[PDB]
């Protein structure tokens, strides 16, 4: 993917993470599971919704064909009308189809960026109290509690609090 | 062995795909189709107003008052007009309705007409108003009839066709749409028998319009057993305008005309049924009942329709690339 | 304390916002408004050429030479034409000026005209040039008068209106725009009185043009106290072409005509009540002068000169700076 | 923002940094200040100005409506003219409005990227001779004076020169 | 110590693209989407040659100006080429009415078949043989006429009686046909050629009416004529019948065309050559695979989209930053 | 470039890497070489080829101007036809020219990101077993085999296997 997270260093998505676009999977002695990041997910929904409504709103005018009749001495203006109506038909068909292809590419990149930014947001909390593996996953050098996990997700992870314990195991 | 937290993204059972500039057929978790390709194959009311079904009459048949179009006859309000392709009753007595396309454009639209008697037969003195009928224009009940909105004026049994004269002064709010004709006989014999002898003219005028025509006698190919023709005319008398009529003979006189009230107008040439349906977007090929922004159904419509494009599908991705495990 | 270096971005006092596909109302440090919505509600000179002000005369009143329109009588040069919506002085003697829209389009484009006498009154023999004036067409001074560019020819005290012929050969390099008419009396009486008895015609021709018309005699609703009508006509006599005029009766003859210079510049006719002033413009719209740098304009789609593209938009502001996230002062 | 720097991991802008779009805020024993990063700011200005001029050049043709009159027997061609003129007006209104919305999104992203890249550029020079505080801020594990500060800004920072000093201070805490 | 480095491709490309951000950016690979090159000639389209009208205009060809005999009978064309300087058109001065509309109808066609619609024998008791003019020479004869018309004149005795003709289409194809009305300069020429009294030309079909009578006057000399002919054209639909009636001044239809109905008419001095094209523009042939072209808006066949652009080069490769040395 | 790699923190391209767009350069006691990364290269080609074909396809309709003549009484409809034909010409010329400028910008960004992502792929695998020289180059703190180089490229690199060797070197220095 362009930011390289989606179908990238994070190979697949999570059928298990049901309540959001972007999220966390954790494993610890108490269990394992999924949790959506509500803030980035809602902000993406907000953004995507606005894009869709901007597109609808800008496309909200119509060209109007008329089916006036033209006589056998009116071939020129008859044909002028046809080329005219078909001309606007071709422009708008082009505008719609290209816009859809383009915006579809950009939207997949947005989702990719959002996932990548969340990955980096966690990474910078954890610092050296955890090992960055290949795949968007971090392996803790200390025991991470359900509160501990909750705190990583909240952006309130306490790095000094686990620094000494994690140095130990990071060396040992 | 160590505890783990991983960053990831949603996946689901979606098989719905989109195209992008970079890639085709990308399965995506959530998406929206902006294009509507479905329609109700019928005609409905628009703004809760019925369309006018011209049935077996063309537009010419209806407004000239062809005798077989009596069911249409006399007052009408419409959201749009439906003209059936095989409608057989139009100009029954052969001839040309001059400026036809421009008339069709004026009538559509057009939301209502009120039919009233513009010139009583009494208007024309010294002439016969009771005999202008033809086997070309049968009603359903009688073999020889004429348009209800015109009088084919003819010679009194005794004497010549005198100068006849008529005036109508538009006193109302509304423009009046009216018709008249000039008869062009087959023969000098038909010319002599119907109208008298000498050079005949039909002259009409208003404050802004001038008309003058004289007969052009010759035999044309037979149409409805007629080798004679009528040149038909239409015009519009504006509020406050007066119409003056004056003829020597060959006048097919305005009898009935229309108060005409005038948005987007539509004449649909279609055979679709008009049902007891209601609707917001009516297309020449059917109703669109949709929230979508594009449609591939028809460029010809009345109401609030989506935007016509040739596209088969216009699906915007909203969610993300679907990569389930 | 420990030594810090921080990576950051600019913020400022800007309250100006832009919209984007993803988000509306984004305040940004720098932006450009690309759309112009200001105009000067007046008409100005375009190429240092003043527009023609028709004033109380319509375009018909002007080129037919309606007597009340003498203020516009001489040669004229203009970069565009302004016609007042309520001008009263047009076709004073009731009638249709045929192919009027195509005449208005021809006059727009539109650089200037030279008035000159195309057919002297002497051209017509055995008929009286002097008679034809109507109460319908007063000048400001005289109650009965006629168009300056036409002669309403009438029969003399003789029983007959003779065949009359006129010729004009264009040796000039400029097209000549000229007018004529056919008179339709309400009466056989007026017809007899004004012209000879019997069948009457007006015929004219050039190398490329043929015209034939005969009077159509009937009573019409009174306009300007006239139940009679005149059919007015216009044409353009190409350089090197000759015009031949022949009439039995009922001819409103060409008297004065115009040498016509077309223009490279787009030609425009503006129907407006806006004032004309001693000012210069590069962009002139029908509802005003645009004096701008901007790419886009929402003022009008009708203009002459070089104007920004017309759009329905209220504003087209492009962000150039970044998101403006200044510190909360408290 | 999409690259996550602006209104992101760097929360706010600096009213103080007057001479550039993107730049540094530094503090040391000698003093504190703001300096724009000249090179990234000038390239963005060049790029944005090109974008604006490109849009203006592409948008520099006009459709021209015309004030022609049409008679009462010219309803069809008069309407044809009207639908034609309105048609081009609607297409162009669409092109300008859509373009501005799209380019405005992309312009904001470019700025976001330039900030993130500037931060990434400093982060890679510094290595573990500095500590990441939040908000795009690094606290040095050694004394960094003005020549040292300018050093980071210029891209010429000497990681070996300070590695020994930085290493001792890092352990001690 | 050992190195692994990540990097990108470079090459000796010096081709550049422009970007919204940047101009003159050299890139490793790119595609030009626009064609600015053309063969300056006319070629066959669908292995069908164009019709070269040579020294004749469309009027000279289709009325059969005697100097356009080259150019007589059937023609099949992919498109028409009309030389700007063609001098043989309407030799006897007058107007071909609805000229533009005739040119558009001929342009719509791909083939005509010339046939004798009204044999001279059609018109009883008038002189078919006499009607020639010094205004219409052939290369061999100083006085001739159009091949497709008969300038009928009264016989020597002589009185011009009513003459009548009919042709019933009977066919699968529309017929394009022509007629005229002679307007003599003089009362003297009128009486010499045609007899005494008011004269008419009247024609009609099931759908059409025509009536005209001479307008007698001197017009400025053109090819030595102060007289005029008014020329007319029409299309007789399959299953339609044409009635012709005149007592004077009729320039009769003689020969007509069964008409087979994009097609185009190119006014150009370019040479037709023994070559094939799939795309032909008025300024030349396009032999290209490109999407866009800046050669011409006017063409026939399958051509790329016309734009005013000098180049439309799409970067496909990346920015080219090859090492210096 | 917006992701910052191309003509950025990686200063130049490789004329030596002829078989792909993006790739690896390696030096070890066995040898040195330029080898393209096939997967990223091929996806970029598929993506770009698709963009070119989509644009060609979306652009494959023509507006068709006509040869029709207009009489001296047809100035208005003749001008109507001219403004109409010029109008569509101005619209399509705009669509093509703006689309090219826009897509060229985005195409370069896509190449820039593909390079940047390959670089981040290697940097996360190596960790502190390698040292970041500038210019997208890593110096291994351990002997790195050809087999070891293949492992970095195909993403199977064993950080534990070389960890003890690397630490001894990194700080003996
Ligand atoms: C797909 O998902 C929806 C919601 O989870 C569910 O209702 C539906 O049964 C599933 N569809 C399939 C694969 O049948
Ligand atoms: C028609 O009636 C109106 C009002 O009664 C009147 O003003 C107008 O003169 C009349 N028109 C004519 C000319 O008869
Ligand atoms: C901005 O927001 C205000 C209120 O939110 C609104 O009135 C306006 O239309 C919006 N757009 C811009 C660019 O100001
Ligand atoms: C018009 O003038 C030119 C030059 O005198 C002359 O040759 C030509 O014959 C004139 N036209 C007529 C019909 O006399």
Author numbering:
A (entry chain F): 1 to 172
B (entry chain E): 1 to 262, 265 to 327
C (entry chain A): 1 to 330
D (entry chain B), F (entry chain D): 1 to 173
E (entry chain C): 2 to 262, 266 to 329
Quote the study on this structure.
In June 2013, the first case of human infection with an avian H6N1 virus was reported in a Taiwanese woman. Previous human pandemics have largely been of avian origin and required a shift in receptor specificity from glycans with a sialic acid‐linked α2‐3 to galactose (avian‐type receptor) to α2‐6‐linked sialosides (human‐type receptor; Matrosovich et al, 2009). Through systematic introduction of mutations responsible for receptor specificity switching in other human influenza viruses, we found that a single G225D mutation in the human H6 HA strongly shifted receptor specificity from avian to human type. To examine the structural features that underlie the specificity switch of the H6 HA G225D mutant, we determined its crystal structure in both apo and complex form with human and avian receptor analogs.
Structural comparison of the RBS of the G225D mutant HA (gray) and the wild‐type HA (green) displaying slight conformation changes in the vicinity of the mutation site Asp225. Surprisingly, however, introduction of the single G225D mutation conferred significant binding and strong specificity for human‐type receptors. Binding was observed only to α2‐6‐linked sialosides, with preference for selected extended N‐linked glycans similar to a recent human H3N2 HA. In contrast, the G225D mutant has acquired the ability to bind human trachea epithelium and lost binding to chicken trachea. Furthermore, the H6 wild type and the G225D mutant demonstrate low thermostability that correlates to a high pH threshold for fusion, and are thus not adapted for human‐to‐human transmission (Linster et al, 2014). Thus, while the H6 G225D mutant adapts the HA to human receptor specificity, additional mutations to stabilize the HA for fusion at lower pH would likely be required to support transmission by respiratory droplets between ferrets and between humans.
